[PDB]
Every structure is written in structure tokens, then in C-alpha cells.
RNA sequence: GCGAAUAUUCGCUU
RNA sequence: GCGAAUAUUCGCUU
């Protein structure tokens, strides 16, 4: 199961406000999995302005839509573009997509 | 975009009983291409009392579950397991996973 | 953990 | 169109 499906299942609100501010409630603080790189990443925020398509600049300093680096990095098609991006702060942060990363418990 | 996605972004509804009917209403009559197999099937009807957990029997007699089938045949991990599945009859019918068919216009 | 390339064999309505 | 096997080279926080 993926954040995104969690998204679509674990609570349901016609409200946009309460569904987002629950959603943001039920997962900051997860560990979850991503499914194209054996790496776990804490849940420390959901970003609702971004999207797949939006960019971030890369180490070697060119700019790609998550859409883009998922698909040329990891053969990964990112179908859903309405979902938001997660935050995850390190020691800039790593941008996450619900559809890419599985679920697991955390503090 | 897959059908799935659809579902949870084309209408949004609270009450599930009238989600149902407009998801049944919306995508009965289009025509979803399956992203592991270049096959198209028109949507006859959506079986909400199955999902892919179900079984069916394959050609050669042996029962295997939608989760089962396309990990081995397709080697398609089906994350969603609280969808419907879509019926086409030709002309057994077929029987697809939302997760598992992009998009189309039809008739 | 997901992939990419070349080569050779393969599986595929559900 | 999605894959599977063997072999050889590879890419990978975002």
C-alpha cells in the first residue's frame, strides 16, 4: 500500500481543509518506504503547493519535475498529478511522492 | 493518469452509496488501455463486491487471485487493495484493476 | 531496492 | 505494451 492510496482510504472528508489537515495530522511522523530505492524517510511535513510536476535543482545543478526524475532515474511513472509532495528534513530536503513510498510504523 | 486515480480526483463524495453511482455513471462506456498489455476493453460495469484479492479461474483451471495474476504474468504490484475491480464482456468476462488502465475517450 | 544498455532464450484475454 | 531468465557493463538523497 502506498501514501497516496492511505490518502484515499485511511479517512474521507468532502471538506478540503479537514481532509487535509487530518491527512497532514494522520502522517507527519511516519517512517514511510519508497519502492524504487531502498531508503526510509521521516514524514516531517506535507507540501500542498507541489505537485509531480513541479522541479527542484539537482547536485549537478540542472533543473527536473519529479515526473522527469523518477521516470529517467528510476523508470518510476508517477500517474497521479494532483497529489502533493513530502518533506523530509535531514541532519535542502528530500521532496517525496505519495504513490512512490509504501507505509510502515514510526515515532 | 490511471482509473484509480480517476475515482478519487473526477468526483468527490462523502457519501458512498452516491459515489458508487456517479463513479458507475462516469466510467461505464469508456474505453482504459491496460499499461501492461497494448489492449484496450470498453467499461460494461464495476463490480464493487470484488477487489483484487478475488480469484477467477485462468484457461488452464487453476484459481489465482487478481494480486497474484499480475505479479507473475505481468510482474504488476497492485498496492490499492479497497478498489472495485471493472468488467468488459465480449463478444467469461474480463475482468481489470482500476490501478492497472490509463484513460480514454469512447463511446 | 528500482531500473538502463547489448546479446541470447522466453511468458502473456481474464 | 508489461515483464522473466542467463551473461556482461552501468545509473541512483531530492
Not at 498529478?81 to 511522492?97: C, D, E, F, H, T
Amino acid at each position: 500500500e502506498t501514501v497516496l492510496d492511505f490518502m484515499f482510504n485511511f479517512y474521507h472528508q468532502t471538506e478540503e481543509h479537514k481532509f487535509q489537515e487530518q491527512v497532514s495530522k494522520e502522517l507527519i511522523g511516519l517512517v514511510v518506504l519508497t519502492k524504487y530505492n531502498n531508503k526510509t524517510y521521516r514524514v516531517d511535513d506535507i507540501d500542498w503547493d507541489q505537485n509531480p510536476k513541479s522541479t527542484f535543482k539537482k547536485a549537478d545543478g540542472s533543473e527536473v519535475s519529479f515526473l522527469e526524475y523518477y521516470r529517467k532515474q528510476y523508470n518510476q511513472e508517477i500517474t497521479d498529478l494532483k497529489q502533493p509532495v513530502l518533506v523530509s528534513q535531514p541532519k535542502g530536503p528530500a521532496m517525496l511522492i505519495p504513490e512512490l513510498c509504501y507505509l510502515t510504523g514510526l515515532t
